[PDB]
Amino acid sequence: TTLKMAYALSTSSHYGAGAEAFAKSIEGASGGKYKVQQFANSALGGEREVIEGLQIGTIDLAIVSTGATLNFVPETGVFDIPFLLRDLPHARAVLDSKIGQDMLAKFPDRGIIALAWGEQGFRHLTNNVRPVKTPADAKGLKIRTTENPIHITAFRQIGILPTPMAWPEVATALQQGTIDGQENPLSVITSAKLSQLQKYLSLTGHVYGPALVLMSANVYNGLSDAEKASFKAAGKDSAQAMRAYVDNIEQTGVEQLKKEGMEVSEVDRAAFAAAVEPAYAEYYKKFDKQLIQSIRDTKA
Ligand SMILES: CC(C)(CO)[C@@H](O)C(=O)[O-]
Numbered sequence: 001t002t003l004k005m006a007y008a009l010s011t012s013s014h015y016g017a018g019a020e021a022f023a024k025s026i027e028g029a030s031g032g033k034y035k036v037q038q039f040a041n042s043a044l045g046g047e048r049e050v051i052e053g054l055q056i057g058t059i060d061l062a063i064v065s066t067g068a069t070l071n072f073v074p075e076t077g078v079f080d081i082p083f084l085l086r087d088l089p090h091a092r093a094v095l096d097s098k099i100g101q102d103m104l105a106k107f108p109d110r111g112i113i114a115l116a117w118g119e120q121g122f123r124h125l126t127n128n129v130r131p132v133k134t135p136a137d138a139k140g141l142k143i144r145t146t147e148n149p150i151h152i153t154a155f156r157q158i159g160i161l162p163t164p165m166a167w168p169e170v171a172t173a174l175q176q177g178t179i180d181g182q183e184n185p186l187s188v189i190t191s192a193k194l195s196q197l198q199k200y201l202s203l204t205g206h207v208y209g210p211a212l213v214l215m216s217a218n219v220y221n222g223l224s225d226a227e228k229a230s231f232k233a234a235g236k237d238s239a240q241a242m243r244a245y246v247d248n249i250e251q252t253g254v255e256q257l258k259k260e261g262m263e264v265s266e267v268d269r270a271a272f273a274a275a276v277e278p279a280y281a282e283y284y285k286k287f288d289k290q291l292i293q294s295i296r297d298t299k300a
């Protein structure tokens, strides 16, 4: 059985590393009973369509951001609150804990199996208009966001004009100048060639970007208990490969982007965190305050 695995970016990206690790894991475990064929570079559409495909069973596997997943499992949105997950060790500890694992168990009610929390890293603001050194500098910029309402609410707080847009639209819109910028981690800014589309980078690190390794219920439900365990294991191997890719690009990424001609600014992240904090008025209408505190207090 050849399973079809979709993702948005190149085979040399963190998604590619994750998909390759998944493929090797399941092919080895299954003695070749299951093989993975990769559909990179958004060939099967935007992430929303990919998730819809898993629900119907036309796509078997995927690695996606949390850009479009709140339309399916809104409860996970808590992880998308700017500055809540503080750094890579904290984010990983939270997602690997019962807090994160309990969230994965919410997907099957929607016809989706969530095998593991993978990773993109911390998202940064890019644009074509001017350097952004302070939150004031960002006001008035037309910045593309994902479809994620938690992100959109945050950016409104510093006067950004957000335009939610699926990923396949972004390069064209940047070139056309209908949006001034976007935000994504070093892993994406490098692998998606955004230095060719964006003059300025500010290292806001405003939110951790998780990823999800997903599988169709169609396929998963058909498996034995041993086979289900092997897909969960491959999910974990995929997540580890993504985290290792991120650990590496976090060391080299800014240097790479400067070489490619980007003007990179460090910022005072505490100023940005303070500027977006009033959005908690909205977040507390969606998420339990005690869950948010438990995330804060998760160690490591
Ligand atoms: C680039 C991306 C599709 C990766 O999942 C996502 O981070 C997004 O939509 O910005």
Ligand SMILES: [Cl-]
Pocket: 101, 115, 116, 117, 236
């Ligand atoms: Cl897991």
